[PDB]
């Protein structure tokens, strides 16, 4: 019963994470790359500093990772292996995390209310800042879900151990990569 609740939250929050990144790319990023609106000279051709590699993280979760998590829905005790299979992909969170300070300063010092304007216009509850913290949140949450599964799965649970290892290694490597 508990292992099924955890796996359900894992898939449900993954869907919302993919929805949230998608929303971020097609509002905040699109308005900058579109050519529909006047871009403050402070941030022009700097979308790369603002959004870092979030496009590539979204492509991972949207093209691969969510499809593969879905496949483990009836196999929660094995889902650790999903994280092992796709370990290399999570290294992009290291890149993303390194760039977040530079992203935040650039938006502070140089964007004035460009993004605030898009938020009002599109009717979004979440600021660009809310969206850009989410990869940092997500990459430190997988380890919590895996730990919860370890409390309610048998010793057919080295197919969690090694997944948890990966998802402890990625945020630690991200954390250790900061200034």
């Amino acid at each position: 019963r508990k292992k099924e609740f955890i796996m359900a939250e894992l898939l449900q929050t993954e869907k919302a994470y993919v929805r949230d990144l998608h929303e971020c790319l097609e509002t905040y990023l699109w308005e900058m790359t579109s050519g529909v609106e006047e871009i403050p000279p402070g941030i022009l051709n700097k979308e790369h500093i603002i959004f870092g590699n979030i496009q590539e993280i979204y492509d991972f979760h949207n093209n691969i990772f969510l499809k593969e998590l879905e496949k483990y829905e009836q196999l929660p005790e094995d889902v650790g292996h999903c994280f092992v299979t796709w370990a290399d992909k999570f290294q992009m969170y290291v890149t993303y995390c390194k760039n977040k300070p530079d992203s935040n300063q650039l938006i502070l010092e140089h964007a004035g209310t460009f993004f605030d304007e898009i938020q009002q216009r599109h009717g979004l509850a979440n600021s660009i800042s809310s969206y850009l913290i989410k990869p940092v949140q997500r990459v430190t949450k997988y380890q919590l879900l895996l730990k919860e599964l370890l409390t309610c799965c048998e010793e057919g649970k080295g197919e969690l151990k090694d997944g948890l290892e990966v998802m402890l290694s990625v945020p630690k490597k991200a954390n250790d990569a900061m200034h």
Binding site: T13, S130, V136, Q137, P171
Partner: protein
């Protein structure tokens, strides 16, 4: 209409995720305690004047000293939380939470929040602490710690019973108005 970024910090033992879920759903989640609370916002009227309250969880970042501050910039008010039945979580307010919050956000209001108020008078909780030569954290300990860190308020709540819970978030808002 005034928007407010409120960030919730403190040890895993405080029940950050549970606190926020129980506040926003108006109920202790009881059946299953979800590990995920995504950034939230809702309109609340305080002292008449309505306000948009934004809530960020930090659960999962407890071991990543350089990732935690990524959430801190442009925060309007912090809840620094400890569990009233974890002396260690209470000491970590002093050792860990207040320093990094001051370092990154020197002029931001702090509310000191004691969670798990419902467990302070619980026989099994009291006993399990007594075996480690400890006791729950009492009210004047909160007050003394609040003063030391420059907390604007010290508040005690339970997610389980909802005692003091709505008040925590009312005061976070009032600390910014």
């Amino acid at each position: 209409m005034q928007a407010i970024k409120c960030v919730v910090v403190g040890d895993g033992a405080v029940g950050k995720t549970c606190l926020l879920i129980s506040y926003t759903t108006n109920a202790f989640p009881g059946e299953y305690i979800p590990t995920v609370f995504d950034n939230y916002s809702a309109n609340v009227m305080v002292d008449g004047k309505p306000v948009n309250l934004g809530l960020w969880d930090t659960a999962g970042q407890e071991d990543y000293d350089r990732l935690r501050p990524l959430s801190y910039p442009q925060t309007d008010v912090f809840l620094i939380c400890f569990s009233l039945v974890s002396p260690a979580s209470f000491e970590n307010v002093r050792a860990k939470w207040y320093p990094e919050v001051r370092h990154h956000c020197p002029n931001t209001p702090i509310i000191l929040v004691g969670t798990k108020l419902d467990l302070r008078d619980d026989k099994d909780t009291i006993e399990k602490l007594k075996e480690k030569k400890l006791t729950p954290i009492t009210y004047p300990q909160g007050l003394a710690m609040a003063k030391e860190i420059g907390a604007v308020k010290y508040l005690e709540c339970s997610a389980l019973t909802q005692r003091g819970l709505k008040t925590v978030f009312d005061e976070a808002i009032r600390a910014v108005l």
